[PDB]
Design a protein around this ligand. Structure first.
Ligand SMILES: Nc1nc(=O)c2ncn([C@@H]3O[C@@H]4COP(=O)(O)O[C@H]5[C@@H](O)[C@H](n6cnc7c(N)ncnc76)O[C@@H]5COP(=O)(O)O[C@@H]3[C@@H]4O)c2[nH]1
Ligand SMILES: Nc1nc(=O)c2ncn([C@@H]3O[C@@H]4COP(=O)(O)O[C@H]5[C@@H](O)[C@H](n6cnc7c(N)ncnc76)O[C@@H]5COP(=O)(O)O[C@@H]3[C@@H]4O)c2[nH]1
Ligand SMILES: COc1cc(C(=O)O)ccc1NCc1ccc(C2(C(C)(C)C)OCC(C)(C)CO2)cc1
Ligand SMILES: COc1cc(C(=O)O)ccc1NCc1ccc(C2(C(C)(C)C)OCC(C)(C)CO2)cc1
Lengths: 319, 319, 319, 319
């Protein structure tokens, strides 16, 4: 579980297998209750599996007819690789295909069934009735790491955090020696609504500015002397400076909000919220596992519902 | 067909429908040739479609028994939302289920078949069978914009290009008047190999640095005075200068490479190449559709072979 | 039972044999209670063992059809070597096969059963099934010293300890006479978490540096004058010095951690913890059996919890 | 394939599946020829698979009786985790087992067969006849990355090479500016026989010494100012200095050799050769993929059979 916000979803578990197992148990109980010859049950089961295998093969060939079109580009110009990418491991599929043909043409017409199955598959493809409901798509995307969040979070870590966090204590110490009473941790805010305002004081008058840390330099992607700066914002409580930190927004949230605004992104508000949660979780995990985040960064996430950003930041601070 | 670099893959086409159509035509011809009553054909076809609908329903029931765990977080507590997410369209799926059961019991036991289908689906779930082939999952993710690259490219546009392209002409003009004359285009390199060395001179000593453009500042996500810079690189040729332009590496390529290197990311080298290529395509498209791209920047794409970066960039400069 | 740290696992025992024995006893009792002619029992038992031998033979034939590709490289071209590597002991396995077939045909078709066994073994191989469970593979690898740690620990002994422990007393004596008196033992830290920060003071400011021991040189793997050094660390306590000793981090832990981080290694965090623990055990064993360990060095092991490294190392120093 | 040495084995392929497939085809053809009721063929095949599942459970419980002894240490004190690691995914295995019981007790005595299988498994465990032939063990260890080589190579990279390679060119340039005509690549030697001599000139009088590079420093594992030096050997051809390089031996080879010499390692000479090849291959792969090894080292491997190390090094050099 993530302590950042109760609203963060935990990774998908194995409850699906539990449900499948209980369903299978009840199902066998019902088969036993009916009392039909279990051999006939088994035969019909294996026949159904064979039919499903044939259907999968036909869907595969349908996709293959077009995956060939990209052979030179997407599949590095190798027909065998295209077949692998389309029908799965060719050896396993071929073996199952052969076994299915044997157990159909053998057990108690094969050509007629093949025709009917092909017709059904073609109908499924043409009508597009075949497809995955949102739950399956989301599960595959999370398990396969296909979510834009994943990418944005890994960028926010590798590109920026991995270079600033190690030097953060040094920069803070130098600034304090040269001059207030700042803490020694970058406080990054994650507005789950992706309502990032450019002017930080715009969010709350209590959030004001004190000074800017010395610009940190470094070569990056050929733009040498690229500089990553920071802003030491001061927490104005009861009209008083309760505390000064290095408060920050996670830039990728702005990116998500914008691509939600635009059209070509093909990205919707519910997706904005979903990817925001996923980004928060992934970044949390990365920082927790990585060493460079040794009490140098604190992640704050707040659900806009009234609301007092300054008080929440102060709460996380005094803790 | 893409134009950036020949290996870039064009978007998937509607060919699969054509393949299914030709398959349907051949299947109908052979079914007619077989010579059996069409009433039996329709009967078996509708029964088989009912079987698929029941299987999908049971798969949805299992996925729901899973997702109800996260209902509170991923679905705001609205049960109907989870049901929609799992079963598909509740109204359409329910209507199809009702029609299926009606026709089966009407058309020439029943609970036995339902049990057998449930058992088959349970085996499929338990033994980890319902896994889409790489091609199909690729198509789905691309269609739904579920790509690691997509987010990175959209950030790059919204977060660097959209903010540097406009003032780029002003910065170039100021440098030219202050001072050998750089070109009026920002040249971005898109190494498919994703090497992205830190300093240009390392990759090709024929490329040399000259000066920096005027630093551009601005307020961005809490930090104000966030200053974006550049680095004019002198393009030598056989020991002589033959052009000057603002050269660049697409940092998201650095992100992709580092992601590939690391392990927690769960990312693969094949995925690295594929995602980088998709990034190039998406950046090209968005830039072409971006009004700020008034020929202010040129995207350079190349793959490792022998190969001289300086010669290729000069060749592109000749235009 | 290990003594370094309570969580360290002792080597696997023969408990599996005891479980097999009790199971055999119970099975024989129940078989006797069932009350059938022992001749049938022996017939079916030997038939089943023959079936297993045939299955193992066929699996070996397939593995041979694979390994003959590498015969030239991994086996020096000696066909008999490959046959031994695949089928097991050629003489013993051949004799068991001959006895099996003789009894099989003798005892109350044949080729049909052989083909069925071949079908079973085929499916097992193709579908991807004959995979050992994690516990069994762990036992096998530990028994055969197929462990990532094993090599690292053996290097650490042969390559640092065996070459520093002897002259360590001389170096300590020289430093003491030159100049607060360090102890006569090398204290090696074994962080199971594998954090291994570069500088001790980072982990615990209570630990401070005092001076370095005399550098030891030597000829090693081409590089002569290869010099191994140390770093005496002052052990403070509540702002006061209470001991000095040559603190040390077991470097191979750095290798394990970085391996876990990287992806090309194909290494997992669970494997990281397991291998680090095995490394501690193996280092303890080798060191105890090493004559050079005349109480010249103490192995310190600890796990993250709150926890103070300085306090624990001092507690060990009290001995 | 590895260009280092023809003797290096390539990674194990998929030929095993090819052999399994052809075996399956032959078995099906034989079944068709004998022409037994294919229904009976199935019945017996599925029953055999059920028997295999029962046997696997028995072996698993036998292993569990041992593993439970280590629950607190090697399995983080969770019975469920122990069962998972001993019997595989409990859900899947349990479901297959339940289906097996239903199909046995249903299809054409269950208790008698269970007793017979239990006796067979107990006999297999007690007699130790159950086991993996060398080919399977090697394949699993290599696929699972359990080979000592793997660890030693990853150490040799992360600990040492990753720190010396980036600064190598700088050190060479500084040395040349201060003073011969060395190249810019650290040449590593991999004696496949693990015959590493401490005195490099001992291998060949032609291999003599010129000077030592400036000692490179750096903090490592608390031993700050740890120094990694180098030796600039000079190639003496025809009594003349043909070339000067940074030739060096791969230290882990010494570790492998010595750990072969000792007894507690439980390691044999053929294993020395095997792990030497594996180490060379893994190191080659890692350096090829990593960026830091950008034409900064050249791996040399030579099979001692007469032999002229100097000529081989010169050949690799002038190339
Ligand atoms: N708080 C904060 N202070 C900084 O100085 C800073 N600099 C970058 N970032 C953010 O962290 C990440 C690191 O940039 P990345 O390399 O992955 O891609 C960056 C990078 O390729 C490019 N870019 C941004 N700033 C610069 C810059 N100064 N110079 C060159 N390129 C830049 O535009 C991409 C997207 O930037 P943002 O997505 O809007 O926020 C960045 C980014 O999320 C910063 N965040
Ligand atoms: N060519 C060369 N020049 C060097 O300076 C050097 N220093 C280490 N190595 C080798 O690279 C690898 C890095 O050592 P690692 O840190 O992983 O464990 C090292 C490390 O824990 C310890 N050790 C060796 N040298 C030192 C040293 N100077 N200071 C502290 N510890 C050392 O002993 C372990 C094994 O050493 P070797 O297994 O014989 O060769 C090492 C090793 O193969 C070197 N190789
Ligand atoms: C991971 O294992 C699997 C992978 C895949 C896949 O690649 O989609 C499919 C199936 C896999 N195992 C399940 C399975 C069950 C039954 C059969 C079988 C018998 C072997 C008993 C007769 O009956 C049905 C059949 C017509 C298919 C032929 O074989 C085979 C397999
Ligand atoms: C990857 O899937 C597998 C995993 C494992 C494992 O984890 O050991 C074993 C086997 C797996 N697939 C192969 C398989 C074959 C046959 C059966 C089946 C039928 C489903 C048709 C009847 O036959 C009889 C049965 C009692 C064997 C179970 O049901 C199921 C599966």
């Amino acid at each position: 579980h993530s302590s950042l916000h109760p609203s963060i979803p935990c990774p998908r578990g194995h409850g699906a297998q539990k449900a499948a197992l209980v369903l299978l148990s009840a199902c066998l109980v019902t088969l036993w209750g009916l009392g039909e010859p279990p051999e006939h049950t088994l035969r019909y089961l294996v026949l159904h599996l064979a039919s499903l295998q044939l259907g999968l093969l036909l869907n595969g060939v349908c996709s293959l007819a077009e995956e060939l079109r990209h052979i030179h580009s997407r599949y590095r110009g190798s027909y065998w690789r295209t077949v692998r990418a389309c029908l799965g491991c060719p050896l396993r599929r071929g073996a199952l295909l052969l076994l299915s043909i044997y157990f159909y043409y053998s057990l108690p017409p094969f050509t007629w069934m093949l025709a009917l199955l092909g017709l059904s598959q073609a109908l499924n493809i043409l009508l597009g009735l075949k497809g995955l409901a949102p739950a399956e798509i989301s599960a595959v995307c999370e398990k396969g790491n296909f979510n834009v969040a994943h990418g944005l979070a890994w960028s926010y870590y590798i590109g920026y955090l991995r270079l600033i966090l190690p030097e953060l204590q040094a920069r803070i110490r130098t600034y304090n020696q040269h001059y207030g009473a700042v803490s020694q941790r970058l406080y990054i805010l994650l507005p789950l609504d992706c309502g990032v305002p450019d002017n930080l004081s715009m969010a709350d008058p209590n959030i004001r500015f004190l000074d800017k840390l010395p610009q940190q330099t470094g070569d990056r992607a050929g733009i040498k002397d690229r500089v990553y700066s920071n802003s030491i914002y001061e927490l104005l409580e009861n009209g008083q400076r309760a505390g000064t930190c290095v408060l920050e927004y996670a830039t990728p949230l702005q990116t998500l909000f914008a691509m939600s605004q635009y059209s070509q992104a093909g990205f919707s508000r519910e997706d904005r919220l979903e990817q925001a949660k996923l980004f928060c979780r992934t970044l949390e995990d990365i920082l927790a596992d990585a060493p460079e985040s040794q009490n140098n960064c604190r992640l704050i996430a707040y659900q806009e519902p009234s609301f007092s950003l300054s008080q929440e930041v102060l709460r996380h601070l005094r803790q």
